[PDB]
From Swiss-Prot, chain B:
The protein's name in its UniProt record: Glycogen [starch] synthase, muscle
Residues binding UDP-alpha-D-glucose, per UniProt: 36
The organism's taxonomic lineage, starting at the top: Eukaryota, Metazoa, Chordata, Craniata, Vertebrata
Expression sites by tissue: Expressed in skeletal muscle and most other cell types where glycogen is present.
Subunit structure: Part of the GYS1-GYG1 complex, a heterooctamer composed of a tetramer of GYS1 and 2 dimers of GYG1, where each GYS1 protomer binds to one GYG1 subunit (via GYG1 C-terminus); the GYS1 tetramer may dissociate from GYG1 dimers to continue glycogen polymerization on its own.
Family to which the UniProt record says this protein belongs: Belongs to the glycosyltransferase 3 family.
Binding locations of UDP: 36
Free-text function comment from the UniProt entry: Glycogen synthase participates in the glycogen biosynthetic process along with glycogenin and glycogen branching enzyme. Extends the primer composed of a few glucose units formed by glycogenin by adding new glucose units to it. In this context, glycogen synthase transfers the glycosyl residue from UDP-Glc to the non-reducing end of alpha-1,4-glucan.
Protein species of origin: Homo sapiens
Disease with which this protein is associated in UniProt: Muscle glycogen storage disease 0: Metabolic disorder characterized by fasting hypoglycemia presenting in infancy or early childhood. The role of muscle glycogen is to provide critical energy during bursts of activity and sustained muscle work.
Domain of life: Eukaryota
Residues annotated to bind alpha-D-glucose 6-phosphate: 2, 6
Entry-annotated residues carrying Phosphoserine: 117
Length: 590, 148, 590
């Protein structure tokens, strides 16, 4: 079997980890016949692949022919789990025959590529090199075995049709991840999911300069023996856009890091949450007037996309929840984190000041408690009891009093833990100001914006992304245009409830495999057949419902959501790949 | 170097005098005689009766000063003394109890300072730490004399 | 309803906590009609009961009549959970009419009491006072309601037949806990459970001076409208001894202290086990040659009874396990604790020496790690990495070397953490020497004997009984003559596996309510129909089976055993009491 992908040497997308995790199961299935094809990169040979100068034990003549004919190729082992047998093909080794190749490419699949797009030319030459390698291999393989070709990415798939143009007896599988033109559709201020039946595809690809990319994407999809797509909604949009119904859906699987004990994922949540509290205390010095044992932590993560990630709907849902909580007379208060990496400079002076004040209060408490420990030790040694008539000392009260005096503050706490480069055009802050969330004492919803990836090297919040995710109570991911969705899957594996939509690939996948997806904590929405107001009202209702449960009910919910990690593991998702490969083999040669 | 090292002696003597610490330790003097175990040639006996005379004199002047005399006289011995090790362990247990109580007090004081108030000592009692402290004091009680 | 027991003011047995826990449910069932009868003790009125000088709101005349007639009684609230309405009757208030009472007691149930047994005379006068109180109450109650009398203990039950001698329209319930003569049977060096069909009861009660006690016990059992017994085997022995088949069995229930999280009982086991390790390290300085992550902790607790608690069978089973582990080439090592309170003086010098050596090693490690922290802090401040060429310092190695030199030991570790007053007649040490367990390096079973109740005031092992029980891995309780059994029930509530026998009340109760009692961790034995060798071989097989599982399997076993706490709670055991009371009411008056 041959895996063809452009993301073997560079980590530009999530395909890298998907392939790395799938390599173990694919190798276990295919023995030593598992080969992977990828481009050669100067930056991806140092600590990314162990180059094997020795010839392949089952393949010696083709490498010699390829090297003698001018092109340069390398064999080796990918520095990932399992046993990978990877080949790296240089992009400049055969850069001297682009004109001849495109001259003989006119009659094959009739694709044209602009001369100023280096990436498209590199993909085209990669496809030519791959089809040449397959031709050489089958010529030198004595035609004894049968070769199956699997393609994961559209740049790497351009050569697939080339194989179909050479009458090569191989099984052709085309797998796509997302539509490139669909990404630009969502920014056109035109409804996309409710108009899926009518696309003027040719022109919208034309004037937007993405015509040829979609052209060979659709050519590869049509020419392939079998076509696969990541999720159900992505399959539907491919059918209504590429005019070809995918044979089967191929959701992405993720390896799960099991623990010795089932409940350990709870303990990792217990301590990590504490690390959050020490932060929030520091961010709320002089305004800590609410019980912190009755506080809920919500968060939304991922790339800084406003409409495509559902930040706005989450914001007005939280505003509605705040309005509702001020009429029910409840004491529950929620804190919402926005891990939205943006462009920022420096830190916020007030936030660091709050951290320093918290540390100073801790130091004062430490000194007073050490004095109390000394006095109590002496009294216990003499054989008495502390009557608290000497712990006053008439001196520690002075320092504690001036500490409390210093803690006093008049201005409101800030909403950002950084300093925005621009503030008149930042959507998040404009929406927050518009809806009226200023972290006031009378409010019941707090907003914390941290436009930077969480890392242990940061001065404030000394935790990475994984620990912070494990510390929260419920992740809200109201995705709008999300092909598959990795963050909700990661949260589900970690063992926390999540809120998703059927529009997202993960939500659609979960909605069609488990009945009644409400008792397991995966709160599904409906942004496809409902208006924005209905969706936000349903989200507010879900948020209130989550706020309604007790601690025991939350423990039940998290425990039940933990058991769903086995569903997303590759051990279960490999069945779809097996089915697709078997169907391709049957279609090619019985 | 004398300030801290003396402290290391106090932690010892406290351990050797659990249940009998009825004198102020800030007014304590430490005398010692070292060297090889020679009785007449090192003046151990004269030091002993001089200290006895000093003890007799200190009980008629009504003074509070108390002296501790160490005899670093290497002799032939086997094993340790069970009472001494018991006293060290009791001192360590008292230290542990004090540490736990002071950690609880630190947590409560941290919370009260965070909310912006003062400790009124109406919640440090907890009706539970007094029980453990009381049984600790009960354990510290001793009837026999400390060993020499 | 009236509860009559001698253990209301004194804690001599476990009936005190049973009644204290049952008071809540009984009061919730009976409203304000729940009254309890108990003796008055000078030591049990200070912080044990709130005396109510005010008359009972529904009862004023009987107390006045009782006080005016010479006897002294008190009303009040028991200082326990729920709302108790307790009456205390003085034992010396009516001590001036013992002769008249026993003169008129000859024709009622024909019982005679020795003059030199003060406790029996006190019980007899208590019964007379109780029956007089019932007579006065029913005379002054206008015979409107119906009174039900419940008796829990045999000393308190002597008056029950007196009521049956006065034609009082009340329901008579007699509940027993154990047979007094059976306790002395087990010390007669004669088989007891295999000869249950033939007892020469009259004589064995005669020459053993327990004739009259059994006499009024059997009289109360026969005269009672209904008879109840703690467990099935106790019911069988009562039927074959008292010649009266109990109507229903009444197992004792225990209140369970629930937690916010289900897995918290695991966490309490995680840290408490650590407190054990710090002990065992101290007890094994200079001989720590086995991995402590693969160590199992077994223990047996309770009163110091040799045959009645199964210490010997546990000992030879552990010896067989040791012999088996030295031929399989396994690395697993088990540590067995014997919490058998005996008479001891002082501590063991070697044990305290080991604790001190462990603390000294900890101090040396702390000093070295502080120096390393300082050096690493400096190197990180200057912006470099620790190359470990300066941490040597040529000085810390000297102190570490002399520390290691001090740690060296030649003699074997001791088997006792105390100093026995006598050693030529202590069964435990004689058996240990006979079977050959000396805590040698080549052995795989370690024995630690701690003849003292575990308390936080102890210098070594600074944990109480509950934490030590929660820290172990499996409690072995091969009871032989145990009426009900509280310790295995406590262990089951705590959430740990246990080993019991059908002879014990708990084992028999569990064996008849849950099918296949092996998957839940309650390993049952058979000491009734099998010889000693068969029982010890089965125990050894069970021990090896427990040693065979992995950590995950042990977690599963403990999690499943935790769920069985609801079975032993009073919420489920109150049904038997309700049934017994209803049957008594039906028998007395329809
Ligand atoms: O999940 P929460 O509602 O915040 O509960 C708080 C903590 O949750 C889990 O970590 C455990 O159950 C802890 O025992 C509990 O203290
Ligand atoms: O030498 P002492 O009488 O014991 O005085 C006690 C200590 O002596 C010296 O170490 C220093 O002067 C210390 O400041 C003092 O606290
Ligand atoms: O029960 P054990 O076999 O000793 O396992 C050791 C500990 O058990 C429980 O306390 C938890 O599962 C811990 O995570 C585990 O470290």
């Amino acid at each position: 079997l041959f895996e063809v992908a452009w993301e073997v040497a560079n980590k530009v997308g999530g395909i890298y980890t998907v392939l790395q995790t799938k390599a173990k199961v694919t190798g276990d299935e295919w023995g030593d016949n598992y080969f992977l094809v990828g481009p050669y990169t100067e930056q991806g040979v140092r600590t990314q692949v162990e180059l094997l100068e020795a010839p392949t034990p089952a393949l010696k003549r083709t490498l010699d022919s390829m090297n003698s004919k001018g092109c340069k190729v390398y064999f080796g082992r990918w520095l990932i789990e399992g046993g990978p047998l990877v080949v790296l093909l240089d992009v400049g080794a055969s850069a001297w025959a682009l004109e001849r190749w495109k001259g003989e490419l006119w009659d094959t699949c009739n694709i044209g590529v602009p001369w100023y797009d280096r990436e498209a030319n590199d993909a085209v030459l990669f496809g030519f090199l791959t089809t040449w390698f397959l031709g050489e291999f089958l010529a030198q393989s004595e035609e004894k075995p049968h070769v199956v070709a699997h393609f994961h990415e559209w740049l790497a798939g351009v050569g697939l049709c080339l194989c179909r143009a050479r009458r090569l007896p191989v099984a052709t599988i085309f797998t796509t991840h997302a539509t490139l033109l669909g990404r630009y559709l969502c920014a056109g201020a035109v409804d996309f999911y409710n108009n899926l039946e009518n696309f003027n595809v040719d022109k919208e690809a034309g004037e937007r300069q993405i015509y040829h990319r979609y052209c060979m994407e659709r050519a590869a999809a049509h020419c392939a023996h079998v076509f696969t797509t990541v999720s159900q909604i992505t399959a539907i949009e491919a059918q209504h856009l590429l005019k070809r119904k995918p044979d089967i859906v191929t959701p992405n699987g993720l390896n799960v890091k099991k623990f010795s004990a089932m409940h350990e994922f709870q303990n990792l949540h217990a301590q990590s949450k504490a690390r959050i509290q020490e932060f929030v205390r520091g961010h709320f010095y002089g305004h800590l007037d609410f019980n912190l044992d009755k506080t809920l932590y919500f968060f939304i993560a991922g790339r800084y996309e406003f409409s495509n990630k559902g930040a706005d709907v989450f914001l007005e849902a939280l505003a509605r929840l705040n309005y509702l909580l001020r009429v029910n007379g409840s004491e529950q208060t929620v804190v919402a984190f926005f891990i939205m990496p943006a462009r920022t400079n420096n830190f916020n002076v007030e936030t660091l000041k709050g951290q320093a004040v918290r540390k100073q209060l801790w130091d004062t408490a430490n000194t007073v408690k050490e004095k109390f420990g000394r006095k109590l030790y002496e009294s216990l040694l003499v054989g008495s009891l502390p009557d608290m008539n000497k712990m006053l000392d008439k001196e520690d009260f002075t320092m504690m009093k001036r500490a409390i005096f210093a803690t006093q503050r008049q201005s409101f706490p800030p909403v950002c833990t950084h300093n925005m480069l621009d503030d008149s055009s930042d959507p998040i802050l404009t929406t927050i100001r518009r809806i009226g969330l200023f972290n006031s004492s009378a409010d019941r919803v707090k907003v914390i914006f941290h436009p930077e990836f969480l890392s242990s090297t940061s001065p404030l919040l000394p935790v990475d992304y994984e620990e912070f995710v494990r510390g929260c109570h419920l992740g809200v991911f109201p995705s709008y245009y999300e092909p598959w969705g990795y963050t909700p899957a990661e949260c589900t594996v970690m063992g926390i409830p999540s809120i998703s939509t059927n529009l997202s690939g993960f939500g659609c996948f979960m909605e069609e495999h488990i009945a009644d997806p409400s008792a397991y904590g995966i709160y599904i929405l409906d942004r496809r057949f409902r208006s924005l107001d209905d969706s936000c009202s349903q989200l507010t209702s879900f948020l209130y419902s989550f706020c309604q449960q007790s601690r025991r009910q939350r423990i039940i919910q998290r425990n039940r959501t933990e058991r769903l990690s086995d569903l997303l593991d590759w051990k279960y998702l490999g069945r779809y790949y097996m089915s697709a490969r078997h169907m391709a083999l049957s279609k090619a040669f019985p």
